Design a binder for this molecule. Structure first.
Ligand code: CDL
Ligand code: CDL
Ligand code: PLX
Ligand code: PLX
Ligand code: PEE
Ligand code: PEE
Ligand code: PEE
Ligand code: PEE
Lengths: 52, 56, 459, 175, 606, 178
């Protein structure tokens, strides 16, 4: 139980906290919406020709 | 007198020897999958002056 | 992963080359050491699994199951060495060999990288359990129990073999990583419906699904204590592990092919919990508890949501531990009164107070008392089902009521009231049985402090 | 404390009123607080200063891990397993980062409700506004992937949403 | 740091030290009950200070000191809410528990497992503090289930008695019925609001829908024993008198009311749920008060009084007056616990006799018990300037000055009269007249433990209403303008109850006999609710569980379809194949038939 | 609880049972003592009004009407003695009753405490052992060949005899074992 309690954080939770803190700080400083509803930018998505 | 103990204690070491052998076999099995060592786009890196491989 | 497999294999020559009065000590000590070694597998990553080699890997779902499987063998050895006292040395060593083979097969099953090796070991687990039930069982119904247990599984899983072989021919591989990365949908065809059915029923039989569970009240009751513990704790979880693995190929056919199974499981939890309310046999009540609890895991797997998957993993671990503890508790009384009737030996709190405490703790854990991991799994699955459909809450709440009802019924009938006047051979509780109860119950409470270790890869 | 960036976790200037007693009776909480300060706070401060003196003799640092930016799932061919693997790992890391951002915004919302007091409905409209937009973005990103999610399924969801938006604009411009 | 957080966490953490020492060499000594009582008294003294800080500046906090697990976006933490309700309720509960433990040192003196009894009482107190101070729904659920399990373990204290086990299981069932709604509320608040924390739930729900509030109402009705789920509270009197005084009288049974009070910012925006709560509280406070006026077991009478007070509390919640409900909880705790201690003293002094029909003239035999019970009844009946006057009369006034269901108003007034009715009965049949107990007089109330424990809550029941009501800040707009006849409604109805009950009781001395009417039989048998709902649904469920689920479905038809059918078919096919008598004359003809069939069927079209 | 029951209740026994039950329920209705005295004297008069009839059919019909009277006029909440089957302290002390055979499972260290009591227990066990066959012989002598007709047991008729089947009746734990 002592070994399990002190397992190194290989699930990377504090790393995610710090990365999120950095991105939130950057996006709050420069007026960004803190998240966009598009994971991948449309500049490299190739949709079909037209709707019909 | 090692007689009346070794004949009773040699089975007491069968499992730790197996564990050591398993660790050694795990290292040898790991030695066969070094095709992309220091070649991944995420961990590609220039070697240190004295080291030869990033991981073994 | 060989650092765990090789010691488990070495357990066999040590058992066979041991003196007749030292087999149990060596087996228990080295099984506990192997469990301690296997504890190192809980160090999982956040993104991908632990690919040890081309043959074995480990993820966040396999590690808790592996730790439970390694931890269970010492308890089975502890519980078995009472009723096997009059056995011959060769028969004792054969029993321990069967248990070790079972552990080795389960360990290699939970880490197999491909589905064919997984199937091979997942069915290789049948012969040791079948031998145990049909050879060291106590009554005359053990033969029928073994036949039922063997044939349900084989009839359910041969089409799985055919489907897996077809999938490898159409896709080129059955490696789980390649399958997961190269996933592709199923067209809504009859052939795809039957390929869905073949890939699913093999695990529904072993959950077991309601209506396909007839083999369980026979196998879990007729088997000896170690056989019952391994059947309830680990062998029921093979179906859940296989389903959570294999639904990767299945989507999106599952969105509507899961309706009959969801209906069957959500009504069968009610049916089995009601069956538990009128049971003249204690072991049969504990066996039906397992079906009632695993119906919820079936629901969680079938609704395909991360919260349901996490709750299913937690519930599988908690159910394994609790069912093993309850079976051991019932065996302690059976070894005294030599009968399985519940109302035969009553008022046992007056005679055995510490066993009464163990019974109370096991009953509280069974009925999902907060903040047990049983509660964590069941509540996560309940929330996932509520998100699936709000009307599921009626069945979930009714099941929670009936579960507590029959759990406290079993507690009160056996431990309360006045002791039977004529059972005058109830000796005080042995140190071995108390230690068995403690080693069953302490991990349950300790896992509440770090529940992320048993929440699976979706955490 | 400087243990956290105070722009990621904003806090009002903490205006507190002056103690202006208007009665002649002694204030019991004042005497109790003096007893607390001199009886429990001071020994704890002494112990913590001893611990800090011990820590100052051994100073080592742990560094935050930085990851390079690898090509994502859109630049990978249909059956290129290595690029697919790297893109999927990067997508998983981005998913975790987005979850942590949502956690940060939720923490602000909870802190704001308690801090404001009874005027919270009007006092922290901004926190509610920030959480609504972040929740909407996170939902549009990861809402319905279910279990067995991957970068490919998120890409397919984004493509379907883009097709729907393009069609909506198509019949919007025709009016 | 300021002392508020440290003291609020310390008053909770020092209640667990005697639990840790339950395996040391103090648990095997007769000093353990004194140790636990001293710990509780010290905890009360320590908790008195955060109350003073709130009384000064209204200081309030939330303390999330430990992070448990993070599931994706959601964060579950060990968070404590130290607001007005918690810091006001902890000292009252600790005071009542201290008095009950000092009483238990005398009442449980001959119990071979008194140390265990004390450990159990302490465990219940810890679970109650967990329930009250919880900031998230999971922690509050942990407390909710802990108090229920401790109720189960303490009701069935004498585990050789069948009825104690029956009552414990009945309480467990009736609380699981509301646990269903609790789980419904948790699930709805998690999927819809994405958090289990109070701060987030309030923020995201400005117009709360029906389902979560109806689930909360169901859970509160289950815990507080409302009309649908009431009968378990009277049955919970199987346990020792201290258990009935502490758990089922003043602290546990108010948990549902506390839960509804904690969610008042969401109940303000819903009117249908408020109407349902009002109607449920009104019917409960009518029905239990009507049942109490014909009961002969004193513990049952006081239990029905407690249930009626809980119904009144639910009525107070249902008219959008939650702070008044919390105030009524705090006031009612004192005198109801004291009433149970007086009843237990009477029971102990009369050799375990609980029926008032065998209690005679105790006014002079037990002067201190009579004084305490008279003061408690006066407080209970809302006598002016008593601790009950500062809550119950204001409740009645608020119900009179609100847009209210008229039937609920009338039922509340009738329950107010019936309170004085039943209170008069306890005094009339317990303390006035000639003795009716066995001749061997063992009456003795000259024990310092009993006297001091009763006296503390006596002083409380006298002065606590005035002390508290003039010290808490005003969170309510008052009813400053009232007609004079409506300002004095509660007093008038209590006086009428006193007079009518006294007249009908004095009628008993007359040398006249008459058979009971049907109204008396309905009232005395609890409206036949246990006579029907404890027999019909249980019988039907237990008979369908065996006839249909066990025998017909599991043992017959599920067996018939899959395994028995295939076994029969394989047996028939095996017999069909295996009975040839070994005569070549038959299967050589079969060979010829096969050869002919093969050529035409498989040969003439390749 | 101490007497072997008969095959049936006679008319006198039924009437006496009804009289006692009616008196108890009337006392339940009449809380005060003097009123109960008045109405109990009236009840005694009502029972004595028909004590001397020699017709069994009319007496049985009177008994039926009296049972119907009692069942219509009974108290729904009659007084019950605390230790009675319906009392509030009926089985309160059954969990503290431990059978005597549990003392044979004690550790020798536990029997080091209380040596004199265990010597007395040992001589009691010797006395129980020395008398069993005589009890069995007496039981198989004094019963009819076609099995016993009543649960009543015989006493010890000789001088060196103990009453048959006495051990579990004599070694009752207690009412208040703790
Ligand atoms: C909140 C309390 C704080 C406590 C501080 C720390 C306590 C650590 C305890 C660790 C676990 C106990 C060990 C289990 C085996 C018992 C050993 C034994 O053989 O007993 C004989 C031993 C010797 O006496 P004896 O004379 O031989 O008696 C013979 C008879 O057996 C007569 O024996 P008995 O009649 O006296 O009964 C023995 C006892 C022992 O039997 C038990 O049932 C104890 C096990 C607990 C309940 C089991 C089901 C609940 C599952 C929930 C899992 C929670 C995990 C928490 C982490 C656990 C870490 C291991 O049973 C009980 O008394 C009733 C237990 C039920 C209590 C209520 C539990 C539900 C609500 C609690 C909420 C939990 C979260 C708290 C924090 C919340 C936020 C602040 O007696 C004891 O040692 C009793 C121990 C004290 C009882 C524990 C009850 C509270 C513990 C709840 C969880 C602990 C939380 C710790 C985190 C800090 C807070
Ligand atoms: C401010 C301006 C407004 C003024 C308002 C009014 C002013 C004053 C008016 C006063 C009016 C009378 C008040 C006293 C009431 C009667 C007292 C009494 O007990 O008399 C005994 C007498 C016979 O007793 P017994 O059987 O000879 O007793 C045997 C021994 O003595 C047994 O002896 P024990 O030692 O067991 O002791 C028995 C015990 C228990 O006594 C009983 O056995 C009877 C208890 C029940 C009646 C108590 C009243 C509760 C009324 C609640 C009604 C709610 C609506 C229910 C709707 C149900 C619909 C089905 O005695 C007591 O508890 C004391 C008497 C009650 C004390 C409280 C009285 C005052 C509160 C009520 C008046 C409030 C005044 C202020 C109001 C302010 C706001 C307006 O029964 C009655 O007189 C009451 C009957 C009234 C209810 C009848 C309901 C109809 C039942 C059949 C209906 C048809 C059904 C057809 C089939 C349908 C199937 C679906
Ligand atoms: C008999 C008398 C009883 C009463 C007296 C009791 C005396 C007091 C003792 C009670 C202690 C109270 C518990 C309060 C928690 C204190 C310890 C806690 O902080 O540690 C936990 C840690 O506990 C462990 O995580 C639990 C280990 C899990 C179980 C170990 C497995 C053992 C093998 C058993 C095999 C079973 C297999 C089943 C499937 C796995 C919390 O983890 P975490 O918040 O992070 O720690 C933060 C700091 N770290 C990260 C640097 C470490
Ligand atoms: C004791 C319990 C043990 C476990 C039992 C498990 C139950 C397994 C059953 C699984 C359910 C799915 C099977 C078939 C899928 C749908 C069935 C049918 O009702 O759907 C309709 C099908 O219409 C008709 O019903 C055709 C089916 C008629 C033949 C099936 C009769 C089965 C009745 C009894 C089944 C008994 C199951 C147990 C066997 C022992 C939909 O109409 P349509 O949209 O046009 O077709 C969709 C299929 N497409 C896309 C391929 C074209
Ligand atoms: C007692 C003897 C020891 C006295 C000396 C120590 C004095 C205090 C110094 C402790 C050091 C500080 C410390 O504890 O570090 C924090 C450390 C954990 O680190 P975190 O980041 O906050 O969370 C872990 C997961 N990330 O805290 C601790 O673990 C110790 C104290 C934690 C609180 C005590 C446990 C209470 C809860 C018990 C379990 C209850 C069930 C689960 C909770 C359910 C809530 C929904
Ligand atoms: C979801 C399901 C909803 C619940 C509906 C009914 C629940 C099903 C009942 C299961 C019963 C089977 C097994 C229970 C064990 C048997 C048992 O306990 O026996 C009954 C036992 C002994 O009888 P006593 O009266 O105590 O006698 C004492 C002296 N002899 O007592 C009981 O506890 C029986 C209780 C059964 C309750 C069933 C009826 C409850 C229905 C409540 C309706 C009101 C709903 C609430 C409204 C809320 C509005 C906001
Ligand atoms: C096309 C053909 C398909 C063939 C499928 C075969 C399925 C395999 C199961 C075969 C079981 C046959 C059982 C049988 O015939 O034995 C009858 C046997 C006779 O008893 P004996 O002791 O041997 O002798 C009595 C005289 N003293 O009767 C019994 O008691 C049966 C006891 C064990 C029965 C076990 C059957 C369990 C079947 C579970 C369901 C799955 C069956 C397989 C197909 C499943 C459907 C997809
Ligand atoms: C203990 C009882 C459990 C019994 C379970 C038995 C049922 C298992 C489910 C079906 C098993 C057979 C399925 C076949 C295995 C998969 C093969 C596959 O996926 O490929 C399909 C093959 O599909 C089939 O051939 C289906 C054959 C089905 C015939 C046998 C039916 C058996 C009964 C079906 C219902 C049983 C399932 C539920 C029963 C539960 C137990 C009562 C595609 O065919 P293609 O060659 O690619 O042609 C399309 C392109 N040209």
């Amino acid at each position: 139980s002592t070994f399990v309690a002190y397992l190194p954080d290989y699930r990377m939770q504090e790393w995610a906290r710090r990365e999120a803190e950095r991105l939130v700080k950057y996006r709050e400083a420069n007026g960004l919406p803190l998240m966009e509803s598009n994971c991948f930018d449309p500049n490299k998505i190739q949709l079909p020709e037209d709707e019909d | 007198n090692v007689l009346q103990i070794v004949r009773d204690h040699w089975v007491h070491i069968l499992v730790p020897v197996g564990f050591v052998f398993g660790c050694y076999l795990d290292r040898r099995s790991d030695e066969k999958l070094t095709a992309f060592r220091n070649k991944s786009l995420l961990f590609k890196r220039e070697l240190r002056p004295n080291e030869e491989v990033t991981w073994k | 992963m060989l650092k765990i497999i090789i010691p488990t294999t070495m357990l066999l020559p040590m058992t066979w080359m041991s003196k007749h009065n030292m087999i149990w000590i060596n087996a228990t000590v080295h099984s506990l050491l192997i469990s301690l070694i296997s504890l190192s597998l809980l160090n999982q990553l956040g993104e991908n699994s632990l690919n040890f080699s081309l043959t074995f890997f480990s993820d966040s779902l396999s590690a808790p199951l592996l730790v439970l499987t390694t931890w269970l063998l010492p308890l089975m050895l502890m519980a078995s060495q009472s009723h096997l006292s009059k056995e011959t040395t060769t028969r004792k060593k054969l029993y321990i060999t069967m248990l070790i083979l079972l552990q080795l097969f389960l360990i290699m099953t939970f880490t197999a990288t491909e589905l064919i090796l997984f199937y091979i070991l997942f069915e290789a687990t049948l012969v040791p359990t079948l031998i145990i039930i049909t050879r060291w069982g106590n009554q005359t119904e053990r033969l029928n129990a073994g036949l039922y247990f063997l044939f349900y599984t084989l009839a359910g899983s041969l089409p799985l073999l055919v489907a897996l072989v077809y999938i490898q021919n159409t896709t080129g591989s059955l490696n789980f990583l390649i399958i997961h990365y190269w996933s592709h949908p199923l067209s809504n065809s009859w052939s795809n419906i039957f390929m869905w059915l073949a890939c699913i029923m093999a695990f529904m039989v072993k959950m077991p699904l309601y209506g396909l569970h007839l083999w369980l009240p026979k196998a879990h009751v007729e088997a000896p204590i170690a056989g019952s513990m391994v059947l309830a704790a680990v062998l029921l979880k093979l179906g859940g592990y296989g389903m959570m693995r294999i639904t990767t190929i299945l989507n999106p056919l599952t969105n509507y092919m899961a309706y009959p199974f969801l209906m069957l499981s959500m009504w069968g939890m009610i049916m089995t919990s009601s069956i538990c309310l009128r049971q003249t046999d204690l072991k049969s009540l504990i066996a039906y508890s397992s079906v009632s609890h695993m119906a919820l895991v079936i629901v969680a797997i079938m609704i395909q949501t991360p919260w349901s998957f996490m709750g299913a993993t937690a519930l599988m671990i908690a159910h394994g531990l609790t069912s093993s503890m309850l079976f051991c508790l019932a065996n302690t009384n059976y070894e005294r009164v030599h009968s399985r009737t519940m109302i035969l030996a009553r008022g046992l709190q007056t005679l055995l107070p510490l066993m009464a405490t163990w019974w109370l703790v096991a009953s509280l854990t069974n009925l999902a008392l907060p903040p047990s991991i049983n509660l964590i799994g069941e509540l996560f699955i309940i929330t996932a089902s509520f998100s699936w459909s709000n009307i599921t809450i009626i069945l979930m709440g009714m099941n929670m009521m009936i579960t507590a009802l029959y759990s406290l019924y079993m507690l009160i009938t056996t431990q309360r009231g006045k002791y039977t006047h004529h059972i005058n051979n109830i000796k005080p509780s042995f140190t071995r049985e108390n230690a068995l109860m403690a080693l069953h119950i302490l991990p349950l409470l300790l896992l509440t402090l770090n529940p992320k270790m048993i929440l699976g890869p979706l955490y | 404390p400087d243990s956290w960036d105070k722009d990621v976790y904003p806090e009002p200037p903490r205006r507190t009123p002056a103690p202006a007693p208007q009665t002649s009776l002694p204030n019991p909480v004042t005497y109790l607080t003096k007893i607390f300060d001199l009886l429990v706070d001071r020994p704890v401060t002494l112990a913590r200063e001893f611990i800090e003196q011990q820590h100052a003799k051994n100073r080592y640092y742990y560094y935050h891990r930085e990851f390079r930016r690898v090509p994502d799932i859109t630049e990978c061919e249909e059956k290129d397993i290595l690029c697919m693997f790297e893109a999927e790992m990067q997508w998983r890391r981005d998913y975790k980062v987005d979850q942590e951002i949502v956690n940060i915004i939720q923490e602000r919302l909870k802190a704001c409700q308690q801090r404001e007091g009874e005027s919270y409905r009007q006092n922290c409209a901004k926190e509610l506004e920030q959480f609504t937009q972040v929740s909407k973005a996170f939902q549009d990103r990861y809402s319905d992937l279910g279990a067995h999610y991957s970068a490919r399924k998120c890409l397919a969801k984004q493509k379907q949403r883009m097709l729907a938006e393009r069609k909506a604009a198509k019949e919007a411009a025709a009016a | 740091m300021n002392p508020f957080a440290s003291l609020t966490l310390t008053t909770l953490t020092i209640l667990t030290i005697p639990i840790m020492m339950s395996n040391s060499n103090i648990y095997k000594t007769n000093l353990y009950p004194n140790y636990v009582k001293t710990t509780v008294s010290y905890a009360f003294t320590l908790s008195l200070v955060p109350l003073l800080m709130f009384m000064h500046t209204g200081q309030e906090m939330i303390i999330s000191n430990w992070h448990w697990m993070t599931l994706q976006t959601v964060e579950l933490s060990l968070s404590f809410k130290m607001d007005y309700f918690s810091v006001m309720f902890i000292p009252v509960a600790l005071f009542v528990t201290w008095s009950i433990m000092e009483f238990s040192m005398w009442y449980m003196h001959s119990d071979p497992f008194i140390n265990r009894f004390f450990k159990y009482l302490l465990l219940f107190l810890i679970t109650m503090m967990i329930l009250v101070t919880a900031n998230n729904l999971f922690q509050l659920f942990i407390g909710w289930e802990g108090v229920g399990i401790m109720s189960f373990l303490l009701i069935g204290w004498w585990h050789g008695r069948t009825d104690a086990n029956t009552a414990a299981l009945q309480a467990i069932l009736y609380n699981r019925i509301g646990d269903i709604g609790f789980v419904l509320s948790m699930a709805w608040f998690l999927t819809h609001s994405n958090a289990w924390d109070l701060q987030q739930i309030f923020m995201l729900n400005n117009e709360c829908p029906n389902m979560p509030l109806i689930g909360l109402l169901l859970a509160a009705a289950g815990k507080s024993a409302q009309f649908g789920l009431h009968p378990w509270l009277p049955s919970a009197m199987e346990g020792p008198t201290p258990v009935s005084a502490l758990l089922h009288s003043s602290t546990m049974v108010v948990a549902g009311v506390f839960l509804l009070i904690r969610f008042y910012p969401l109940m303000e925006t819903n009117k249908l749920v408020q109407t349902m709560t009002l109607c449920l509280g009104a019917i409960t406070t009518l029905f239990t008060a009507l049942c109490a006026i014909t009961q002969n077991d004193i513990k049952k009478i006081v239990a029905f009084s407690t249930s009626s007070q809980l119904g009144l509390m639910m009525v107070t919640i249902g008219i959008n007056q939650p702070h008044l409900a919390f105030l009524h909880i705090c006031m009612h705790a004192f005198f109801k616990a004291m009433l149970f201690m007086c009843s237990g003293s009477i029971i102990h002094s009369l050799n375990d006799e609980q029926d008032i029909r065998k209690m005679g003239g105790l006014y002079k035999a037990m002067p201190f018990t009579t004084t305490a019970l008279i003061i408690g009844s006066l407080a209970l009946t809302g006598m002016p300037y008593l601790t009950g006057f500062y809550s119950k009369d204001l409740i009645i006034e608020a119900v009179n000055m609100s847009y209210t269901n008229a039937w609920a108003l009338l039922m509340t007034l009738i329950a107010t009269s019936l309170t004085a009715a039943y209170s008069t009965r306890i005094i009339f049949f317990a303390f006035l007249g000639k003795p009716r107990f066995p001749p061997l007089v063992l009456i003795n109330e000259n024990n310092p433990l009993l006297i001091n424990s009763i006296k503390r809550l006596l002083i409380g029941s006298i002065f606590a209403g005035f002390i508290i009501s003039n010290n808490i800040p005003p969170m309510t707009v008052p009813n400053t303008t009232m007609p004079l006849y409506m300002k004095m409604t509660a007093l008038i109805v209590t006086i009428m109850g006193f007079m009518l009950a006294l007249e009908l009781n004095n009628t008993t001395y007359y040398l006249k006999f008459k058979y009971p009417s049907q109204t008396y039989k309905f009232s005395n048998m609890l409206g036949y609710y246990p006579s029907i709902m404890h027999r019909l649904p249980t019988y039907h469920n237990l008979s369908m569980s065996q006839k249909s689920a066990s025998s017909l479905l599991d043992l017959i038809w599920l067996e018939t379809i899959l395994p028995k059918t295939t076994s029969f078919i394989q047996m028939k096919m095996s017999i069909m194949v295996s009975n040839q008598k070994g005569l070549i004359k038959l299967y050589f003809l079969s060979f010829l038939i096969t050869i002919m069939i093969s050529m035409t069927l498989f040969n003439y079209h390749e | 609880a101490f007497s072997a029951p008969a095959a049936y209740l006679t008319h006198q026994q039924k009437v006496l049972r009804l009289y006692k039950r009616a008196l108890r329920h009337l006392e339940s209705w009449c809380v005060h003592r003097d009123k109960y005295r008045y109405f109990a004297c009236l009840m005694r008069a009502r029972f004595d009004e028909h004590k001397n009839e020699k017709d069994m059919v009319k007496a049985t019909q009177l008994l039926r009407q009296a049972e119907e009277e009692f069942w219509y006029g009974q108290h729904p909440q009659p007084y019950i003695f605390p230790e009675s089957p319906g009392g509030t302290s009926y089985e309160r002390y059954e969990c503290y009753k431990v059978p005597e055979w549990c003392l044979d499972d004690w550790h020798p260290s536990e029997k080091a405490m209380y040596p004199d009591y265990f010597a007395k227990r040992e001589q009691w066990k010797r006395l129980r052992r020395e008398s069993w066959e005589r009890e069995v012989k007496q039981l198989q002598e004094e019963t009819p060949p076609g099995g016993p007709r009543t649960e009543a047991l015989p006493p010890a008729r000789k001088e060196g005899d103990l009453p048959p089947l006495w051990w579990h009746i004599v070694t009752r734990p207690r009412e208040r074992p703790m």
